[PDB]
């Protein structure tokens, strides 16, 4: 399902980032970067979820799992 992050979506993220031209090897490297980021956030969110006696990963578990990593996310945990 990592190929569901399509090449127009990666190109849209890069054009939001200000990137003028993009090589064809960015798309297989941005998918790996997204894999590593989502593994690092989802492992902490599943750790918080398993610490509580719940089987549903809530919204606050993602916000706490990001404030763990130092990247705070405003807008869901208040």
């Amino acid at each position: 399902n990592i190929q569901g992050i399509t090449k127009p979506a990666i190109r849209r993220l890069a054009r939001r980032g200000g990137v003028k031209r993009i090589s064809g090897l960015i798309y297989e490297e941005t998918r790996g970067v997204l894999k590593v980021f989502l593994e690092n956030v989802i492992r902490d969110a599943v750790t918080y979820t398993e610490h509580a006696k719940r089987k549903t990963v809530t919204a606050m578990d993602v916000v706490y799992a990001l404030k763990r990593q130092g990247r705070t996310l405003y807008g869901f945990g208040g």
Partner: protein, 95 residues
């Protein structure tokens, strides 16, 4: 010159750039590995919070890697620039 119009349009809008359903299936696919094969439920705002965080991380990594690209004397991004920005930002800021 459609890159200038596209960058000028995408730097104003606030909507999510990755579509919501294949990001949801990607998050399910990654989440089922850390739960030792059992499947978890996700709140509707949990996937949206994860998608906001992932897209903001991706656009910040892309503007850092484009600073690296313009440092190298070019305009095309090569994955060596993203790989270099991941290790100049550090071990938990770039990873």
């Amino acid at each position: 010159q459609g890159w200038l119009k596209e960058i000028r349009k995408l730097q104003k809008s606030t909507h999510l750039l990755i579509r919501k359903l294949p990001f949801s299936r990607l998050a399910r696919e990654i989440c089922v590995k850390f739960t030792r094969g059992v499947d978890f439920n996700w709140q509707a705002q949990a996937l949206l919070a994860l998608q906001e965080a992932a897209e903001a991380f991706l656009v910040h990594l892309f503007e850092d890697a484009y600073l690296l690209t313009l440092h190298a004397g070019r305009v095309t991004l090569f994955p060596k620039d993203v790989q270099l920005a991941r290790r100049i930002r550090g071990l938990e800021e770039g990873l």
